Amino acid sequence: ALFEPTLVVQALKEAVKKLNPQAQWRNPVMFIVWIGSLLTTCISIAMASGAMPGNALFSAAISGWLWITVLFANFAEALAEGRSKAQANSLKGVKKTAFARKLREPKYGAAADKVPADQLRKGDIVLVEAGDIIPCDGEVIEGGASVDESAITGESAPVIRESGGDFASVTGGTRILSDWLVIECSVNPGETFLDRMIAMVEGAQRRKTPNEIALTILLIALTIVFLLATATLWPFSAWGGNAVSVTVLVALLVCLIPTTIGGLLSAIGVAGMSRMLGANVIATSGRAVEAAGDVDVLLLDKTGTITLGNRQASEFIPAQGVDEKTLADAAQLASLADETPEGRSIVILAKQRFNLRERDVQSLHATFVPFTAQSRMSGINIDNRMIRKGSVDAIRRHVEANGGHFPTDVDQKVDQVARQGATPLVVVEGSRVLGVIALKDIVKGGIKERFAQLRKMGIKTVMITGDNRLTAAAIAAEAGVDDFLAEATPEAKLALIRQYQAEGRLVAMTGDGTNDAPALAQADVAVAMNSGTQAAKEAGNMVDLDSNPTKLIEVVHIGKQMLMTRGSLTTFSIANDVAKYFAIIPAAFAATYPQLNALNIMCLHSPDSAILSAVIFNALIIVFLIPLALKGVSYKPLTASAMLRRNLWIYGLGGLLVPFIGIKVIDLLLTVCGLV
Amino acid sequence: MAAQGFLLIATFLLVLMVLARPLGSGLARLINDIPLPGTTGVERVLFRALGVSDREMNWKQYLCAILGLNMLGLAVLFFMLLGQHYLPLNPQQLPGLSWDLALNTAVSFVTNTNWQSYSGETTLSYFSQMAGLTVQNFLSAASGIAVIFALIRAFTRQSMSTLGNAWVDLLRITLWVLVPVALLIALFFIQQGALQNFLPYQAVNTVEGAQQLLPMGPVASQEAIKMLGTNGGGFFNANSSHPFENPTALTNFVQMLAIFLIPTALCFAFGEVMGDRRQGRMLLWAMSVIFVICVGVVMWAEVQGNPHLLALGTDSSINMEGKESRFGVLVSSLFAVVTTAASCGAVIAMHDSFTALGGMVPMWLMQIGEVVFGGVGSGLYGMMLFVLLAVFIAGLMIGRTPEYLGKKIDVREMKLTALAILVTPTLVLMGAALAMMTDAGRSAMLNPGPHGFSEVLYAVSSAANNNGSAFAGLSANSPFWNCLLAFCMFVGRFGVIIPVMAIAGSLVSKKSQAASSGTLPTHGPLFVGLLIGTVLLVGALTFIPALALGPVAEYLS
């Protein structure tokens, strides 16, 4: 959203003129500057008509530049808020309207009803066709096609959605291509994660993070010590000679307190949230984003997250007593009813490659056995053959429960299937074992480099799989992760959460399944996927719109950038004050202590020029550092000591040096312009 | 001269580092609730007789214990000083103190400040000196070391609520660290020539025919504890300039060693209790670098000395005014830096007669919060406050959560660290301003102008920072000065002790998470420089305008 658009700047400047009266006292440093500006304005009015000092022009210039300092700090805050509001309003402009096809019965083609957007609740069934905008988010119960999510994600290539599979939920405001998707409503419109983020951005009542609160406490303490020194300077010089004027004291106080970071804190926070939004990541609050910069372990589900899913039968090794035209029939009889994308792919390719389409799909006495994650069972008892299939451990458990035994050829076949990375899956009649059907999975692509970057960040990435141990090892070696955890129940993921949190290590994770809700609830960072379900998106504190597993790179980038921008600007503001002393103190004490003029190492022209130059630099450093606060600091992955040393050398030394040059240049410009 | 100064600093630091390491191990054993060898049995029967149980209080009851002991000592000492003319051991028949002087002296000796707005040999009796003043010299030091024991236990304890037994800590410190070491130091002082008796004031027939009255009393017993507990409460008005308190150069070397002995041993004990000795070495490196820079600056300023001496016919510009002749200006400068950095009120030399820079650097060293070995316990927890500030800044600049020794730094600890940092500069600035707007606060001045403002600022800084060292040209015996300084000492001790105990109670509940690859090493030259820069920059940004209107103005005059 550009850097400084003309309309954004001109509207938010009027906003700055509108956030003067009561938006100032929430910020203590800027309320101190506001009070000093008002006091210096009244002092200048008294000097003009009603007070014995006659230098009303100098006090007027000081008051005007203090008001300009307040205006530039509010300009930083308003520019950040306006950029965030512009991004949220651009994302708000979807074509989600009152066009819908309500269905009283969830079958296809029900009454062709038309209902408005407000007449929608938690429980509803809607239909969409080709080129239709999605009214409300929800899982798809019938049909499947390509859904173009360009208007939400920011990138094209329609995603493939399947009825009740891994890609079940659909994002609202997205066009529908090719076939139809019968969609049952999950959550009523207006209550969406996108809607909550839009409401949080527009009308910015953003809650401060604990890190921002602690930094605000530190800035308040610095404001208190600087106010104490400034206030006590009046009697200290009053006894020594002529008392120092109040306007010079107020100017020194404003130049002393952390004006830069104190005016740019809200800009840093809102710009960090806007950069989070620009990475196609929705965040509930900044607490999770700032906590993401402290995590050391990332948890990963295999299918859906690190891989595209949609497993297909490729090798299809049979057994000795199966030969041909039996394994496909057993697979179809076991997989005709379970609502999983790999099962549907097996169904639509087994009859395709074996010409076994003559088998009926409905026979009026189907058991309709569903699929449970922990049991790993699927199959229909249709002819007292009670056919089932599942993972290797589940097959061994079911054979050891009723059947006799298994020979070594089944182990050899599942090992050969897991050699190339495809997960093993074997069918059994119940008393005898059969051939092994493979399920090929495709890696998401260029993820080895991003996992190397995660390893360079010091985050020990580890993927929780289930499935089979050897194929988990193969896919872990192919992906490039540090470790893996196979044969996992859904309780084991929460167990790993609590085990990593028992060490004190802060844990991050990504997931897109509906069985991961306690995991994303207990996780500190719970980045969901756009392809994930509504329950997982609601349970997660953050959701990714790119459907990318290693979006934690960008999240860690933005969180560390926010924290280092805050710390660097605080260090810069603190280090500027020695040059503020060297500009103001010999200038402030020139008649009561002319012997202090030796401290004017900057060789400034006049005391009034020196004080004015210090105030001008204090006003201008905020508007010069608006782009730095908006873009964040340059984050490079190094060790902690090296990063601290680089940030110190480029910010503390910068605050030691740069204000000297700035005050000197401002003084020379004033001298050659003849203003003072 | 520079070679002699370098040799003096190197010898002093080497002997201090050699001596403070076995005491560091003993203090680490005291922190870890392990009784010292040979103390078992007698310690148990003493605890049974005193009625202290095996209870283990939390931070609230620990702080209430320390505050109650301090208030009881304050009441006892105040009544002892008010009614000292009824108590025995008064050969001079010295009358009882006034209400303001007694209140100031009581708060002064309870708050480990030991400011003295009186002459000891003219004002106080022997029983008062050896029975209220010495017992408060022991008790305030024991209270400070008990508070830092609580803070170190909070840093080393994992997800508990208790903080040790406060009475057991106080008794262990006083009986096994303070009393025997002070006994040895006092015996060495007596051997060198310090005073320890109870005779009346001896009459002397001067050789030329005059008559001087020599004060007597148990000087060495109080001298040992005022050295050991960073106390600095002089038996006489001359303090450590008096030959009855500090007779020899070897005695003064032992004096400086005893001043720095317990803060350095506490840093070593902290490093050993946490297991990583690099933390204690980091703290000691920071204090040692700042201390060496300050010592070099002060000796350079004092060797430059009075510029008018060669104009008025003198061998050298060496600032020997207000300095004892048995000690060089290098030794006097070193002692001045040691006492004004270590929160000790002892003076080898009148700091009022020091030069402008040689009075600024001691006064700025008090004003930065007494973190360069700044007192028994008090210096270590003030340095801990600055370490939490530094690790907050470092965690911000590295993008991680603020972290020190495995424990998180959160909003509550930042609030309490900020308040504890805020207490003492607030007291210094407001007390100096109140003295500078009042005729009672301005009529006590002796030197005119910027050095008189330096006198007022030095007095308020030493009162609020629990130092007690004075220019002594200020006439602080007025009721206004007594009450103002007593308020400064009371708040600058207890309103820093209370939030440190609150930080300890906030940090006991947390768990020390183990280090990782991304963690920041809280040691090494990078963090030493960061902590030094934080301390010096915070103290500078607080106090440069005051220095500019005082000692900098005097220097540039």
Binding site: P28, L227, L228, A231 | K415, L419
Partner: peptide, 27 residues
């Protein structure tokens, strides 16, 4: 000492009270 000094002392104490309030109640 005078009305102006009284007003300045009162304003400084009010600002200090506001800043201490903001530090204690930093939401």
């Amino acid at each position: 000492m005078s009305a102006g000094v009284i007003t300045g002392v009162l304003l400084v104490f009010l600002l200090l009270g506001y800043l201490v309030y903001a530090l204690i109640n930093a939401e």
